[PDB]
Amino acid sequence: SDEVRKNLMDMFRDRQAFSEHTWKMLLSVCRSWAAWCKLNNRKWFPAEPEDVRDYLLYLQARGLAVKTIQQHLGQLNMLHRRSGLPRPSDSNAVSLVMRRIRKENVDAGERAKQALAFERTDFDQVRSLMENSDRCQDIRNLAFLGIAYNTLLRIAEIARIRVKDISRTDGGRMLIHIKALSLGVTKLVERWISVSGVADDPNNYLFCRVRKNGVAAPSATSQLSTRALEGIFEATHRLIYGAKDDSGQRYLAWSGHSARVGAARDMARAGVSIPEIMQAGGWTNVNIVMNYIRNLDSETGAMVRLLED
Amino acid sequence: SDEVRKNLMDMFRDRQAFSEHTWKMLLSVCRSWAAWCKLNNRKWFPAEPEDVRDYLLYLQARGLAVKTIQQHLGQLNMLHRRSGLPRPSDSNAVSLVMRRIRKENVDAGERAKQALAFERTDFDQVRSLMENSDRCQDIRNLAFLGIAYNTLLRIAEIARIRVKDISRTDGGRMLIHIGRTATLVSTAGVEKALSLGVTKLVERWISVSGVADDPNNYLFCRVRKNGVAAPSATSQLSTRALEGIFEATHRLIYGAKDDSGQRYLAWSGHSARVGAARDMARAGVSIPEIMQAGGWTNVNIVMNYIRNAMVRLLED
Amino acid sequence: SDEVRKNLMDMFRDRQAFSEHTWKMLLSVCRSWAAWCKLNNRKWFPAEPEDVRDYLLYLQARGLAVKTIQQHLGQLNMLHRRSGLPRPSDSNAVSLVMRRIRKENVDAGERAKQALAFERTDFDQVRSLMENSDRCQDIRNLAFLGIAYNTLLRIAEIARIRVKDISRTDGGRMLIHIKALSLGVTKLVERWISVSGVADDPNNYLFCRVRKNGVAAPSATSQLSTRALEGIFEATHRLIYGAKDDSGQRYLAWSGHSARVGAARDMARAGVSIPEIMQAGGWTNVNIVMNYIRNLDSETGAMVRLLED
Amino acid sequence: SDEVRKNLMDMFRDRQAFSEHTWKMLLSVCRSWAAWCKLNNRKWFPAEPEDVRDYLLYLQARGLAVKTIQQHLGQLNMLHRRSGLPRPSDSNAVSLVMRRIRKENVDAGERAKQALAFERTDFDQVRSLMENSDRCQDIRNLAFLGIAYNTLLRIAEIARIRVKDISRTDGGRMLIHIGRTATLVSTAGVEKALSLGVTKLVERWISVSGVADDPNNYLFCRVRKNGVAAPSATSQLSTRALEGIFEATHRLIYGAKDDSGQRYLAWSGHSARVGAARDMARAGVSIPEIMQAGGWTNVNIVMNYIRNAMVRLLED
DNA sequence: ATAACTTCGTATAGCATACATTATACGAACTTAT
DNA sequence: ATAAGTTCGTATAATGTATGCTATACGAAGTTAT
DNA sequence: ATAACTTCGTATAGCATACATTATACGAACTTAT
DNA sequence: ATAAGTTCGTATAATGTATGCTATACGAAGTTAT
């Protein structure tokens, strides 16, 4: 018990060993697991395999994804290893049930999802409606969509971009120190800069909030949240399609990764090689890229080519 | 003895962690081992290494294949390992007898057998004949064989396909989502593309069957004597019936099989996998691409299917 | 000790678990190790790690190849596992010394060797001298060299060939149930058959001994030893080059694998693909094939192509 | 304490099981850890997790790179694991502080550095200048750089090449046998082919040096002030001197380096590896072929060297 | 004397293998200025 | 009020790094045949 | 009644991962018939 | 004697198989909507 107290003091002292997002997930899983334990009269710390098994089945019965059940077990495993206790995973009951849960959920037709593609057809269509707009929100949102599509940067990465992070290459194409922009997108990002006044301080983040009057507020210390960048994708989708489908299902509108998904797919349509599609978005594992471009005629495989010839 | 009974019931309680086929073979081997034990008055649980050894020699003497004998050993090993007991194979008596049985049978000329290939030419011939049939059963069967050859999917994988699993490409080609295979259990799964021609074969079957009247319906269903399809969301076309399609198709073209009792005299469930791999190699498809087509993660088995140059060099 | 006696009775009872060649090697290593032990006052059964270490170093000091030292350790490991005792490999001293021996022997310039290639230049040259010969030995030896080169079969495999194992394909090319022969080689194998009279019994092995009178002796029960097939390769080399180099070094003349080595190399010169070079000789691991064709201009690699263009 | 001392001497006795460089770094880290312990009055063997943790924070505060701090931890871990003792990293204090030190340094913008590429153009330029020199040292240096670029071998591998290691192809191209690399210790080893041009550069160096007067001579040797080569079979041209060749060659073309104290302002021992990988990718060489060229067994590092398309699609 | 090394000590990269952290999704509650 | 965010908690997708050697990077001091 | 299945039991293949057996080399001793 | 082997022991090169599921192969018996 003193070994566990020490281990827990270790954890708090070296807090910064893990990111904020990891801690939030860790705390969220412990909350959920302790609530279940209380309601079901189980001990939450030293977690028993039989109780961890029951809780995993409860999570399945709640209709949670296999990958979610794995996060819960993964966090429980982490709390126990960092407390010097045995991990629930290393028990026969839990490894069997997890294996069981995996097979059953797949046969019920559970699908791993991914962002609705934001491609060229969409970016030309959005440009068609927003490019003649004098509205500061529209000018900011169009510049963001160009960067997202052109760079394939994640939303946290785009929110971090500073004015001083932007340089210039051949023909006057912008370059962002973390990717090079096209002439048309460089132009869009240029217009936003003028109407926003972000360049008036080099340490300012390129993207900032725009209030209801239409007036932008640059900041060197506050970034536009990733939630607001998802907001831009959603609102852009509503513009063209109106409110999204009923009952909270995921990826019914565009979101953060939509442009990454989309740019990958448009590269594949252009017969661009996977090894270089991977380099464009900074991918290292191919199972993610191939999952974005899997349903394209260019990716149909060798049997389809043999049968059609 | 307390833990052993607990370990057993832990496995039984989460039986779905394993294939229904594993359980089927465990019980079949247990039946057969228990029978051998009764005949020789022996304790069948905790199995004794010397007894298991006698039993494997007994199976050899019954003329059973090396792979059958390995299955019986493997089931016994699993039952003991998951009981928390030493495996029969943990003893020299059992592990040495198994090597010996293998080498003696091989030396006497036992070879593992392989499914009769179902290739592009066979598919072309079958399609030239059956595509003019208006019968619902012929339309199903030709669409099945199209899928089998195009996708290299196993019969169980084809049987689990539901209508909602089918989507479309830009160009109008069907894609089938496959979540569970013999080697993969994933929510990501895989997408299997159909050629334009095979797409149409499948299209024709959907129309005449009415399986799309419910997206949860399995793509393939039984067709009764009066050509009326019986779609279901709870029952699949058995893998046994899919095998019958291959056998019936072979019968249509080549007539009835010998009387010799051999396996693989007609096409079977695995026939389109072995055939498609071979057609790909002949067309000079790359090995990574063949592997991707059949969902293999290992260069060796793919290489083994394609074994029919030095002559050409010597001429002169 | 009763557990060890049992384990040893297990071994003798299920003798046939291992081939004769494995047993011969096992017995040869135990002989060598027990002799060393006696001379050095060590206990040979239950082998101690410290003694196994000393013996491994002794084998190195005797000038033995790294792969030979591994056989000795591998057999010692096998005797101990099949006796239910701890393997010497699983001890810290032995794993360190073996790792040490590996590094030292390589830096002293120890080379893994392989059969001197018997190629087309050699097979045409041999044909040039032996094809107009009425001598029964010459006729048998030329037929053997054609099969060895053309099939790439190992010597044990060629010795097993029966007359009833040979059929025929297109143009009258022979086929051997275990590979197809060329027209010129099929002709050579045909001539041997006539002068030998092996076909006069289907169960006779294709190749049989030829005594000093020049008269062949067919047999359905006795094969020509692999040692005699190596003899054919050596004697053929002496014909052209005379006696081999001084001091017993290996592969100074042709041997059993010479034709396998050679046919692989000639396929590579013909730009034949490795995946199909592998199929010709029944290879499954590429490290062996690539080792036969490594020093060929066709195999020089991508840097040589880049630099020369 | 008896076993610990035995395990230590077992490792010392078979020290050749490890690289001379591993031992060098163990002792250097031990020196530095022992010094830190003396300053804070601490027991340095069996190392205490809390002390090791303080020490790693101390290294961070000295401005040392994340990879340096990892080396100090790694040496301490090895000393304890091979002693038969628990590693400092077996404790949460040490394993958590190491993550923290990494993340804090990275967040503050620390990046690992990479050798300045030495590419085909550089080789072409160097060769256009030095090929007209009759000096023995220039002839050696150009042959060295030819080998470095052509083969992608590491400096230590080049330094170990003996004359007897060189053979020839059909077409007259040199092949170098390499038995020991940073990642491979084999009696089979590898053969490294030289282009016709590089072959000639090496040919010229052999002639003027007289290294072939003994097949056991190392290919490369020192050349003293009067241009006379000093071949040896017992002494190699130090890897430090090979580095000097790269630095001197860079100096010849670009002048003296800054005063900034940075690493990688001139070419170094690893410069031709990074350069050749990049030239290959640019020429559209396949990834398996690049891997085979440098002797890599893993697709990831090869991919990392070549990172300089979406623009081209957007035009318009 | 000097060129051209060798030797060495601290600093840090390469490399392959093994294993878990950290990101986005999104409804919703909260905050601020218009 | 409300646009237009930010902060939050939880659901789920997507990257990452730890490990155990073995190596190079480079200034500085020492060496030897000219 | 029957086609067209389903269900089932014994037999055996597929498949991927992990790990050691079995072949040739060759000097030499031994055997047999010429 | 000796050609021309075979058998042997040991040195070293080169293939192989064991493991733990999960699947198909197929005859036979049982079922149900015609």
- Among partner residues D96, D307, D310, which is closest to A14 by beta-carbon distance? D96
Nearest CA in chain C to B305: C279
In this structure, are residues C277 and C284 in contact, taking their beta carbons and an 8 Å threshold?
no
Nearest CA in chain B to C272: B309
Give the nucleotide at minimum CA-to-C1' distance from D24: E9
User: How many Å apart are CA D126 and CA D120, to the nearest integer?
Assistant: 10
User: How many Å apart are CA D136 and CA D228, to the nearest integer?
Assistant: 7
DSSP-derived pairing of the beta strands D185-193 and D174-180? antiparallel
φ, ψ of residue D162 in degrees (nearest 5): -105, 155
Q: How far is B164 from chain A (nearest CA, A)?
A: 9
User: Which residues, numbered 167 to 206 in chain B, qualify as contacts with chain A under a Cβ-Cβ cut-off of 8 Å?
Assistant: 167, 169-171, 173, 175, 177, 179-180, 185-189, 191, 193-198
CB-CB under 8 Å, A7 with D99: no
DSSP-derived pairing of the beta strands C174-176 and C166-168? antiparallel
Instruction: Give residue limits of the domains in chain A.
Output: 1-111, 113-304
- Which residue's entry shows tokens 């954890």? A11
User: How many Å apart are CA A233 and CA A257, to the nearest integer?
Assistant: 9
Q: Please list the active-site residues of B.
A: 154, 270, 273, 296, 305
DSSP-derived pairing of the beta strands B185-193 and C174-176? unpaired
Helix (H, G, I), strand (E, B) or coil at A188: helix
User: How many Å apart are CA D275 and CA D115, to the nearest integer?
Assistant: 9
CB-CB under 8 Å, C102 with D7: no
The strand pairing partners of C176, in sequence order, are C166
Nearest CA in chain B to A305: B195
Helices D92-107, A2-13: crossing angle, 10 deg rounding: 10
User: Would you call A59 exposed, middle or buried from its count of C-beta atoms within 10 A (0-12, 13-18, 19+)?
Assistant: buried
- Most D CBs within 10 Å: which of C100, C287, C291, C303, as the mutation test of the D interface? C303
DSSP-derived pairing of the beta strands B229-230 and C166-168? unpaired
User: How many Å apart are CA A109 and CA B186, to the nearest integer?
Assistant: 10
Handedness of CA A235, A236, A242, A247 (dihedral sign): negative
Q: Which H helix or E strand runs over B132?
A: none
User: How many Å apart are CA A218 and CA A203, to the nearest integer?
Assistant: 10
For residue C132, give both structure tokens: 């107009």
Its CATH architecture, for the domain C1-111, is: Orthogonal Bundle (1.10)
Chain A residues within an 8 Å CB radius of B194: 304
Chain D residues within an 8 Å CB radius of C67: 187
CB-CB under 8 Å, B314 with C185: yes
Preceding amide of D316 cis, omega within 30: yes
Query: For the CA atoms of D276, D278, D281, D287, what is the dihedral angle to 10 degrees?
Result: 70
Question: Which residue, B180, B16, B187, B190, is CA-closest to A67?
Answer: B187
DSSP character for C109? T
Q: Stated in angstroms, how far is B264 CA from E25 C1'?
A: 52
Active site residue D55: no
For residue A33, give both structure tokens: 């697991």
- Residue D8: count other Cβ atoms within 10 Å of its Cβ: 15
In this structure, are residues A261 and A117 in contact, taking their beta carbons and an 8 Å threshold?
yes
User: Would you call C200 exposed, middle or buried from its count of C-beta atoms within 10 A (0-12, 13-18, 19+)?
Assistant: exposed
CB-CB under 8 Å, B103 with C14: no
In this structure, are residues D274 and D305 in contact, taking their beta carbons and an 8 Å threshold?
yes
Question: Which residue, A35, A46, A43, is CA-closest to A79?
Answer: A46
For domain B113-308, give the fold.
Answer: hpI Integrase; Chain A (1.10.443)
User: How many Å apart are CA C103 and CA C204, to the nearest integer?
Assistant: 50
Helix spans in chain B (H): 2-13, 20-39, 49-61, 66-81, 92-107, 120-130, 136-151, 155-160, 196-209, 239-254, 271-282, 287-294, 299-305, 310-313
Question: Which residue, A119, C133, B225, B136, is CA-closest to D310?
Answer: A119
User: How many Å apart are CA A249 and CA A240, to the nearest integer?
Assistant: 19
User: How many Å apart are CA B60 and CA B102, to the nearest integer?
Assistant: 9
For residue D85, give both structure tokens: 């003792």
For residue B130, give both structure tokens: 């059956």
**Resolution for this experimental structure (Å):** 2.4
Q: Which residue spans within A83-136 are E strands per DSSP? A: none
Helix (H, G, I), strand (E, B) or coil at A174: strand
Helix (H, G, I), strand (E, B) or coil at A153: coil
Q: Please list the active-site residues of A.
A: 154, 257, 260, 283, 292
In this structure, are residues D297 and D291 in contact, taking their beta carbons and an 8 Å threshold?
yes
CB-contacted nucleotides of strand H (7 Å): 2-28, 32-34
CB-contacted nucleotides of strand F (7 Å): 2-28, 32-34
| B149-163 CB burial, b ≥16 within 10 A, e <16 | bbbbbbbbbbbbbbb
Question: Which residue, B248, B155, B256, B150, is CA-closest to B202?
Answer: B150
Question: Which residue, A41, A36, A42, is CA-closest to A61?
Answer: A36
Chain D residues within an 8 Å CB radius of C66: 187
Long-range contact list for A14-21, CB < 8 A, 24+ apart?
A14/D92, A14/D93, A14/D96, A14/D97, A14/D99, A14/D100, A15/D100, A16/D100, A16/D103, A16/D104, A17/D96, A17/D97, A17/D99, A17/D100, A17/D103, A18/D99, A19/D103
In this structure, are residues D193 and C304 in contact, taking their beta carbons and an 8 Å threshold?
yes
Its CATH architecture, for the domain A113-304, is: Orthogonal Bundle (1.10)
Helix (H, G, I), strand (E, B) or coil at A222: coil
In this structure, are residues D264 and D115 in contact, taking their beta carbons and an 8 Å threshold?
yes
User: How many Å apart are CA D169 and CA D175, to the nearest integer?
Assistant: 7
For residue B315, give both structure tokens: 């001429």
- Among partner residues A96, A301, A306, which is closest to B193 by beta-carbon distance? A301
Q: Which H helix or E strand runs over A175?
A: strand A174-176
- Which residue's entry shows tokens 């290639």? C117
- Most C CBs within 10 Å: which of D4, D7, D16, as the mutation test of the C interface? D16
Quote the distance between the C-alpha of residue D41 and its chain's center. Answer: 37
DSSP-derived pairing of the beta strands C216-217 and D166-168? unpaired
Preceding amide of B316 cis, omega within 30: yes
DSSP string, B182-201: SS-EEEEEEEEEPPHHHHHH
User: Would you call A273 exposed, middle or buried from its count of C-beta atoms within 10 A (0-12, 13-18, 19+)?
Assistant: exposed
Handedness of CA C76, C78, C83, C87 (dihedral sign): positive
Q: What is the largest CA-CA distance in chain A?
A: 72
Query: For the CA atoms of C262, C268, C269, C272, what is the dihedral angle to 10 degrees?
Result: 130
Experimental determination technique? X-ray
Q: Which H helix or E strand runs over B179?
A: strand B174-180
Question: Which residue, C167, C164, C190, C165, is CA-closest to C178?
Answer: C165
CB-CB under 8 Å, C302 with D289: yes
